[PDB]
Design a protein around this ligand. Sequence first.
Ligand SMILES: *[C@@H]1O[C@H](CO)[C@@H](O[C@@H]2O[C@H](CO)[C@@H](O[C@@H]3O[C@H](CO[C@H]4O[C@H](CO)[C@@H](O)[C@H](O)[C@@H]4O)[C@@H](O)[C@H](O)[C@@H]3O)[C@H](O)[C@H]2NC(C)=O)[C@H](O)[C@H]1NC(C)=O
Ligand SMILES: *[C@@H]1O[C@H](CO)[C@@H](O[C@@H]2O[C@H](CO)[C@@H](O)[C@H](O)[C@H]2NC(C)=O)[C@H](O)[C@H]1NC(C)=O
Ligand SMILES: *[C@@H]1O[C@H](CO)[C@@H](O[C@@H]2O[C@H](CO)[C@@H](O)[C@H](O)[C@H]2NC(C)=O)[C@H](O)[C@H]1NC(C)=O
Ligand SMILES: *[C@@H]1O[C@H](CO)[C@@H](O)[C@H](O)[C@H]1NC(C)=O
Ligand SMILES: *[C@@H]1O[C@H](CO)[C@@H](O)[C@H](O)[C@H]1NC(C)=O
Ligand SMILES: [Cl-]
Length: 585
Amino acid sequence: EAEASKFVEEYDRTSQVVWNEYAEANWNYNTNITTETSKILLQKNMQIANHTLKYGTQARKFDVNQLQNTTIKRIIKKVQDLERAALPAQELEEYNKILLDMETTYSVATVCHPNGSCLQLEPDLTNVMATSRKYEDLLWAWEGWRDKAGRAILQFYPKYVELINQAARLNGYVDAGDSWRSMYETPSLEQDLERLFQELQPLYLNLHAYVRRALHRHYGAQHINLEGPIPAHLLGNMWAQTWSNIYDLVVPFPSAPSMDTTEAMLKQGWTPRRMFKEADDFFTSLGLLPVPPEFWNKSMLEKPTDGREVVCHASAWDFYNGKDFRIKQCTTVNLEDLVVAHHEMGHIQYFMQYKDLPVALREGANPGFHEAIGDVLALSVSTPKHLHSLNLLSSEGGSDEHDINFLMKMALDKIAFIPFSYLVDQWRWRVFDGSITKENYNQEWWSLRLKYQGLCPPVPRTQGDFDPGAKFHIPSSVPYIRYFVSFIIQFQFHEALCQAAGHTGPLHKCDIYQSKEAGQRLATAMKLGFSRPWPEAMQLITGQPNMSASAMLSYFKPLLDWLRTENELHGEKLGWPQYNWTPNS
Ligand SMILES: *[C@@H]1O[C@H](CO)[C@@H](O[C@@H]2O[C@H](CO)[C@@H](O[C@@H]3O[C@H](CO[C@H]4O[C@H](CO)[C@@H](O)[C@H](O)[C@@H]4O)[C@@H](O)[C@H](O)[C@@H]3O)[C@H](O)[C@H]2NC(C)=O)[C@H](O)[C@H]1NC(C)=O
Ligand SMILES: *[C@@H]1O[C@H](CO)[C@@H](O[C@@H]2O[C@H](CO)[C@@H](O)[C@H](O)[C@H]2NC(C)=O)[C@H](O)[C@H]1NC(C)=O
Ligand SMILES: *[C@@H]1O[C@H](CO)[C@@H](O[C@@H]2O[C@H](CO)[C@@H](O)[C@H](O)[C@H]2NC(C)=O)[C@H](O)[C@H]1NC(C)=O
Ligand SMILES: *[C@@H]1O[C@H](CO)[C@@H](O)[C@H](O)[C@H]1NC(C)=O
Ligand SMILES: *[C@@H]1O[C@H](CO)[C@@H](O)[C@H](O)[C@H]1NC(C)=O
Ligand SMILES: [Cl-]
């Protein structure tokens, strides 16, 4: 066991250099797309391959079940996962071969009009989904993308499942479904997730029905059955996972602005650094670690002008060197990016306060936490109080409706995104379970689309199609249930901070600002990183060891009432018992 002690020491000492090297190129390329940087990156990819496999094979020689230093126990258990590397080289070779074929297929698939005009998934087709109100063109866009991109993925999916299942078993899991579900470190996950979902049903069903009514007056009864599920191609998003694009058709109250925050930010001279600077101020008032000085010289807060090409997905980066932390965002001076900024700083704040752990535990308490902390520090930003506190809005009449408008806009993503994020990983889990096969992939997908989102496809579909290929995270083999965890637990934290900050009354009016205790309440939680089962941190924050939806239901309580009330004014019937209806041709 003393050698096990030494082993973890060398692992850190070597791994820091390998990941920092990896990050150094990985950052350099994400900002500097120059082709040779990719070559440099790929060799570094070999090193992490060398490193991951070298120390992983050694890690499997220790028997963890006899160890009693708790830190080493979790460290070794993590490292023993060889993931792809447990596969035979031939199949590992075969596995990577398949991944790129899938990734390539999706990466170059496009929908072309009959004249040969070709539109790409982003931003081109996404603009269509967001902006068109033409039943015909939306259907064409949704149907087309699923026809060229979706159908083609059946060229690889079956063997892909078999292979990652083979890998998962060789890493000690029952199947790939077991492998991912294990990272929430809690065996009853699905049971917990199931209950969590049911507790949102009263809210979600009310919201669902109200959106349906909105669709009803724009698409008409010929395409909208007020008594059935909603056509899944109208939710304003290619996958209908986020419904915020239709807010204009769904807003409960016009006269929403007291001012245009975009125009306001311009008037006050807001700049990307100033925006992020305001975030640091909010973060500083919360007593968290101030950002390290090198950050302000190496982050990239604006679109570069030196002809470098950038991968513009905003995200946060840690170089595992206790000094280099960076944010990469094509920052536009508007309220949207202001939330993005606080979200990104949320990750950075999280990185800084677990910097004291060895690399092997430099992760969130669970995959959700890292993506959950990202929101909480941002939530207050868009509340009317905080929006006003920075004069982003001049004084407005104190209507609840403006609260309601904000809450719905929030719900139209926070809520709608829940069931979709649930369904994907359930569909995959049962496919990894072998309980679902290709012969009915499509039926299991849509059946879950019905049960969980209250959706049915716009037109009938038979085999030869494989609709799930239409969502990036599937062919890219990336899990989703973390996002579900993020959109639940973030409300527990918000309640906990508001409770600790002493705020009373409607929860959405709470503002963390300057709460010297509230910040420390999170701080002690964050420093645990990934060394502990997330229940310890969850308790340390909120006072409970389980995930609870109740915080969320209370947060949206006012919107529920107004939406629920609206259902009565229109007599809207909740649910979708009449499963089979679709828009008329
Ligand atoms: C994005 O990444 C690119 C790669 O890092 C950057 O391109 C580099 O930019 C420098 C100028 O800033 C170019 O300089 C030229 O280099 C060649 C070859 O230099 C190599 O050999 C000499 C010895 O002969 C050695 O001292 C160097 O360290 C290099 O190993 C010279 O012949 C030229 O006279 C000139 O100095 C690089 O060639 C160029 N490299 C690549 C791979 O493109 C680019 O600037 C980055 N963008 C930003 C904004 O930083
Ligand atoms: C379990 O093992 C870890 C790993 O070595 C121990 O971590 C050391 O903790 C001391 C202070 O307690 C530090 O000065 C060392 O630098 C740490 N070493 C490493 C490699 O992290 C930890 O102390 C042990 N904990 C228990 C409860 O036995
Ligand atoms: C291919 O044909 C389609 C259909 O006529 C064209 O799409 C139209 O594009 C114009 C602007 O270019 C829009 O105002 C129309 O609303 C579009 N119609 C539809 C049904 O989407 C497309 O531009 C043509 N492309 C080429 C290269 O000829
Ligand atoms: C790293 O992997 C490559 C794969 O071909 C191998 O040739 C090389 O020897 C490995 N490095 C070490 C130190 O074993
Ligand atoms: C950032 O770099 C510039 C030189 O490019 C220097 O003038 C400035 O002082 C640096 N600031 C920090 C905090 O390193
Ligand atoms: Cl995961």
